[PDB]
C-alpha cells in the first residue's frame, strides 16, 4: 500500500505552476495550458524506497476559492511556492504566498520549497543569490526548475516530500 502526500502548488499566474505539474505527471511540456483550470492530480512514485501517492493541487487565479482549494490549503502537507526567474514581480509576490500559508497553518514551520521556474529562458531578472537570500530567511530549500527541459522538476517535488517527512511522521 501507498503513503499519500498532499501537495499544493501556489504562486502568481503565469510562472509555470501548471507546466511543472504536467511535466511531473505526464513527462511533457505544455506551452498554452488554460490559465484558469484548477484541479488535483495523482501520481504514484517511489521516493527513497517508499511507494507514494502524491495528491497535488495546481492552483489557478485568486477568484473566490472552491471548497476543494480551501480544503487543500487547510489540509495540505507541503507547498511549492513558485516564481519565474524572468518575472521579478512573481518573485516579489512570494512574500504574499508565504504569508497566506503561515496564516492558514498558524505556523512559521510549514513544509515548503521555493521554486524558481523557467530556468531555460535567457531573460533572467531574479538572480540565484536573491532567491537564496529569500529561502534562507524562510528556512526552506530553493530549487530552480524548467518545465520545458524537465531540469529540477522531480527534484522540487521530491524535496517537498522530504521536507514533509522532516516535519512529521508519514
Ligand atoms: N520556457 C519556459 N516556458 C514555461 C515554463 N513553464 C511554463 N512556461 C510557459 O509559461 C506560460 C505559463 O505557464 P503555466 O503553466 O500556464 O503557468 P501558471 O499560470 O503558473 O499555471 C505558458 O506559456 C508556459 O508554456 C518553463 O519552464 N520554461
Ligand atoms: Mg495554471
From Swiss-Prot:
Which positions bear N-acetylthreonine? 3
Q: Please give the function described in this protein's UniProt entry.
A: Ras proteins bind GDP/GTP and possess intrinsic GTPase activity. Plays an important role in the regulation of cell proliferation. Plays a role in promoting oncogenic events by inducing transcriptional silencing of tumor suppressor genes (TSGs) in colorectal cancer (CRC) cells in a ZNF304-dependent manner.
Motif (Effector region) positions are 33-41
Positions contributing to GTP binding: 11-19, 30-36, 60-61, 117-120
Reaction equation(s) it catalyzes = GTP + H2O = GDP + phosphate + H(+)
Q: What is the effect of changing residue 35 to L?
A: In NS3; characterized by a defective GTPase-activating protein sensitivity and a strongly reduced interaction with effectors
- Disorder named in the UniProt entry: Leukemia, acute myelogenous: A subtype of acute leukemia, a cancer of the white blood cells. AML is a malignant disease of bone marrow characterized by maturational arrest of hematopoietic precursors at an early stage of development. Clonal expansion of myeloid blasts occurs in bone marrow, blood, and other tissue. Myelogenous leukemias develop from changes in cells that normally produce neutrophils, basophils, eosinophils and monocytes. Leukemia, juvenile myelomonocytic: An aggressive pediatric myelodysplastic syndrome/myeloproliferative disorder characterized by malignant transformation in the hematopoietic stem cell compartment with proliferation of differentiated progeny. Patients have splenomegaly, enlarged lymph nodes, rashes, and hemorrhages.
In the record, the effect of residue 14 to R is given as: In pylocytic astrocytoma; somatic mutation; increase activation of the Ras pathway
**Chain positions found as N6-acetyllysine:** 105
Could you tell me where this protein is found in the cell? Cell membrane; Endomembrane system; Cytoplasm, Cytosol
Q: How is its activity regulated?
A: Alternates between an inactive form bound to GDP and an active form bound to GTP. Activated by a guanine nucleotide-exchange factor (GEF) and inactivated by a GTPase-activating protein (GAP). Interaction with SOS1 promotes exchange of bound GDP to GTP.
Entry's EC annotation: 3.6.5.2
Tell me the gene name: KRAS
Which family does the record claim for this protein?
Belongs to the small GTPase superfamily. Ras family.
Q: Which residues are reported to be glycosylated?
A: 36
Q: What is the protein named?
A: GTPase KRas
Q: How does it sit in the membrane?
A: Lipid-anchor
> Effect of altering residue 62 to L?
Promotes GTP binding
Organism of origin is Homo sapiens (Human)
Q: Name one GO molecular function term.
A: identical protein binding
Q: Pfam families annotated for this entry?
A: Ras (PF00071)
Q: Which GO terms describe its cellular component?
A: cytoplasm; cytoplasmic side of plasma membrane; cytosol; endoplasmic reticulum membrane; focal adhesion; Golgi membrane; membrane; mitochondrial outer membrane
Q: Which lineage is the organism of this entry classified under, starting from the top rank? A: Eukaryota, Metazoa, Chordata, Craniata, Vertebrata
Amino acid at each position: 500500500h501507498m503513503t499519500e502526500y498532499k501537495l499544493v502548488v501556489v504562486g502568481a499566474d503565469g510562472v509555470g505552476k501548471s507546466a511543472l505539474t504536467i511535466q511531473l505527471i505526464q513527462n511533457h511540456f505544455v506551452d498554452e495550458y488554460d490559465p484558469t483550470i484548477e484541479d488535483s492530480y495523482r501520481k504514484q512514485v517511489v521516493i527513497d524506497g517508499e511507494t507514494c501517492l502524491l495528491d497535488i493541487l495546481d492552483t489557478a487565479g485568486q477568484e473566490e476559492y472552491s471548497a476543494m482549494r480551501d480544503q487543500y490549503m487547510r489540509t495540505g502537507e507541503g507547498f511549492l511556492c513558485v516564481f519565474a526567474i524572468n518575472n521579478t514581480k512573481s518573485f516579489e509576490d512570494i512574500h504574499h504566498y508565504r504569508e497566506q500559508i503561515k496564516r492558514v497553518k498558524d505556523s512559521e514551520d510549514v513544509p515548503m520549497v521555493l521554486v524558481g521556474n523557467k530556468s531555460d529562458l535567457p531573460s533572467r531578472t531574479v538572480d540565484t543569490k536573491q532567491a537564496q537570500d529569500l529561502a534562507r530567511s524562510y528556512g526552506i530549500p530553493f530549487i530552480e526548475t524548467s518545465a520545458k527541459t524537465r531540469q529540477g522538476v522531480d527534484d522540487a517535488f521530491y524535496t517537498l516530500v522530504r521536507e514533509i517527512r522532516k516535519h512529521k511522521e508519514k
